[PDB]
Amino acid sequence: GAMAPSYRVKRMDIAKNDEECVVNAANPRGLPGDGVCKAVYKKWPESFKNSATPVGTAKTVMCGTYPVIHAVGPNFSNYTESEGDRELAAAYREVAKEVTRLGVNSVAIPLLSTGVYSGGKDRLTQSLNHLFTAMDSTDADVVIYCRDKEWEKKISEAIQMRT
Numbered sequence: 296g297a298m299a300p301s302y303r304v305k306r307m308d309i310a311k312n313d314e315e316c317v318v319n320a321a322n323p324r325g326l327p328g329d330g331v332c333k334a335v336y337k338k339w340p341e342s343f344k345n346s347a348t349p350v351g352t353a354k355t356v357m358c359g360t361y362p363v364i365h366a367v368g369p370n371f372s373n374y375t376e377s378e379g380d381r382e383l384a385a386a387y388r389e390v391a392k393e394v395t396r397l398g399v400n401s402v403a404i405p406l407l408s409t410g411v412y413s414g415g416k417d418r419l420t421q422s423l424n425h426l427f428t429a430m431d432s433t434d435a436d437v438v439i440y441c442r443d444k445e446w447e448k449k450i451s452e453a454i455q456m457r458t
């Protein structure tokens with residue numbers, strides 16, 4: 296575990312992370328995809344061997360010895376708000392199981408279902424709160440990756456609020 300497990304946020308490409316493993320915002324079919332998934336495909340293409348997994352699950356595949364945790368958030372275009380919320384919570388619980396199993400001291404994680412899968416809604420608070428519910432009981436250093444300057448401030452404020 297980390298000596299004083301923390302949450303941090305960085306605004307940059309998750310393919311440049313400084314952590315012991317990465318969570319991919321994957322699609323269920325293990326396809327290269329877009330956004331976080333395409334950056335992950337470019338950096339760790341070997342990790343997409345047999346990475347297909349259902350919605351609400353995570354499947355880890357090694358790129359050399361570096362673990363890529365493929366986490367499949369729901370596409371809110373297809374799910375009801377209610378069923379989408381259940382699957383988004385579930386995907387993060389499966390990420391916490393994998394991070395624990397791998398014995399890493401740190402993990403890079405994007406906010407699931409906040410981009411192309413958001414159904415055109417702002418889901419920062421919803422996705423971040425499911426991330427916390429899952430990860431609070433782990434002792435890995437969690438580093439959250441985002442792209443948007445305003446999201447960086449809101450994530451930073453949410454982390455600081457609880458400290």
Ligand SMILES: c1cnc2c(c1)NCCC2
Nearest residue numbers: 306307308309441442443
């Ligand atoms: C997250 C992912 N990609 C990028 C950024 C952040 N910032 C700059 C351009 C590329």
Ligand SMILES: c1cnc2c(c1)NCCC2
Nearest residue numbers: 308309330331334440441
């Ligand atoms: C491409 C690569 N990394 C990231 C993104 C896109 N979007 C969210 C933050 C991390």
Ligand SMILES: [Cl-]
Nearest residue numbers: 408410411412
């Ligand atoms: Cl997304």
